[PDB]
């Protein structure tokens, strides 16, 4: 019974349907909810995902990945609730998004100290419940790898090695971060197919991806829906692209979309096509009718979407 | 009723009495308390606050300003329980301590929206409770004034202009951060006399305090007690020198005491002499005594403790 579940029996990866790798329910900074509570409102924050993970269903969607961690306000309790309205089957993980350096808490601590708290979420449970953690996610980008950033690559291998969870990353696609993360987990004994190095989507340079995917690891193509990283036709193209150049096997596609999250809204950008709706379903209704139509057939689709997150949890 | 305290009717400035300007009843990392609660213990953290206040009191302290905000959890329930507990005046304040960058929900959002949240917890109240912050807290470290820890001092400008609440900051003693969070506040607008500039007590660099002082900001002789900056005899040196100098109606003595810290413990370092016990009253059992056997009277001691907090807050 290898992948745990929230608020479900754990199932065994081969039953675990066609999958969406990398969404998130919900999104915050956990310090400004705490202390500005008046920006938030949880029920419109349920709602919006309960709706979000029915209409992913109505599509065939089984099992949710969500790698909400420290630093993106991941909430246990929030999560099981979601599961008790939809049924989906939904993993969760454990982890830190840092893009520079830890906070005040990790002065003074080891390596070991850090990779003890992914340990305890996925072996004894999530926010004091007995839901656990089924990977570890970890963060790079603009920064680079600074200290902290590397310390926490570590620890990730550490808790891979003792647990054998897989690890998502975030990277930024325009610098090197997703290979170096790659590089670090490697070097520290971690499997390439025990690794998604996320984000990669957000660029077309090919020959990058291709890079990663080729030292072993999956290829997030994820954003789908994003059009401030790379517009959705043009990922479509790249994603077209690696299909038809043998990637199938490395490629996992998802849309990071956050059902609701807090971040300022960005200055709004008009392009000659209208912005197709980032959603959950985005893949549904653009990318995989795209991609059909221009000749890639349902074993692809089953190899993207049901037989890659299979061996990823494997 | 100039002054906001935490689970009682606002007092007039002129009332304060003998006042601890800088302490802390808890402080925590709210993503890493969030997300792993397992390291934390709730009820310790309280009989901890609730033993310091009591002994405070025991030695006259009347009023406790506690400069805990987000970025070191700040729990306005937390507070009003020990306020319930030991009857202390409490002065809760709000802003936000950050060395580099601001978490993500900033991303995309105006100097203006970080001042109403400063403002909406002075005017509203704090964290969904009718207890308002009497002041605004601001930090810069290491890094120096980074783009965002700029938009944060200019925040703070803007809620005291509109408030008249006083401005406390954390600072690096060692390099000239809180000589240009002086600066760039006055340039704002704010009355340097409104302003306290803190952990100043961690050089013994007396030029440089002085500068500040004479600008016309109160400096903040407060860590007292944690050796790591500077021991207490230095310390105590320092400011007797500063008293002996003539500068009594700037300095500021706190211990920045936290009953309960999440930060991991440091290295031990001893030295000849035994180190102080670092408590909300080190200053009853080593520094008032060293002062006053050192020549400096009961009217300095009313002018550190009870006339400057007076003015600070007026
Ligand atoms: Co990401
Ligand atoms: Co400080
Ligand atoms: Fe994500
Ligand atoms: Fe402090």
């Known amino acids: 019974m290898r992948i745990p579940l929230v608020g479900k029996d754990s199932i065994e990866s081969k039953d675990i349907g066609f999958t969406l790798i990398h969404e998130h329910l919900r999104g915050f900074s956990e310090a400004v909810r705490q202390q500005w509570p008046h920006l938030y409102n949880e029920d419109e924050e349920f709602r919006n995902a309960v709706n979000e993970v029915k209409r992913a269903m109505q599509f065939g969607v089984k099992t949710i990945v969500d790698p909400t961690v420290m630093g993106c306000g991941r909430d246990i309790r929030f999560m ?10 939904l993993v969760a993980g454990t982890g830190i998004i840092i893009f520079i350096d ?5 002065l003074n601590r080891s390596i070991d100290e850090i990779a003890d708290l992914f340990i305890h979420d996925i072996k ?21 790898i600074t200290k902290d950033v ?14 054998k969870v897989p690890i998502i990353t975030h990277s930024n696609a325009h610098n090197n971060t997703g290979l170096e993360q790659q590089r670090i987990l490697t070097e520290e004994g971690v499997d390439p197919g025990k690794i998604l190095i996320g984000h990669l989507g957000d660029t077309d340079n090919i ?17 789908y829906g994003l059009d401030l990283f790379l517009p959705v ?13 043998g990637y199938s096997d490395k490629i996992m596609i998802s849309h990071d979309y956050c059902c609701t999250i807090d971040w300022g809204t960005a ?3 008009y392009k000659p096509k209208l912005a197709p709706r980032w959603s959950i379903t985005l893949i549904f209704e653009d990318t995989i009718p795209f991609l059909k139509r221009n000749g890639v057939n349902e074993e692809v689709i089953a190899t993207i979407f049901k037989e890659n997150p299979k061996k990823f949890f494997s």
Chains 1, 2 share one sequence.
């Open 124 to 144: 004894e449970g999530i926010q004091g419940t007995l839901n656990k953690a089924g990977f570890v996610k970890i963060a790079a980008d603009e920064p680079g």
């Open 150 to 163: 590397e310390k926490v690559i570590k620890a990730a291998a550490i808790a891979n090695k003792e647990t």
């Open 207 to 223: 020959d990058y991806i291709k890079k990663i995917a080729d030292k072993g690891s999956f290829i997030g193509l994820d954003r």
């Open 102 to 106: 830890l906070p005040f808490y990790f």
């Open 80 to 89: 099981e609730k979601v599961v008790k309205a939809t049924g989906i089957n």
């Open 267 to 269: 200055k709004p950008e």
């Open 233 to 245: 036709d043009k990922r479509n193209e790249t994603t077209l692209r690696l299909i038809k150049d």
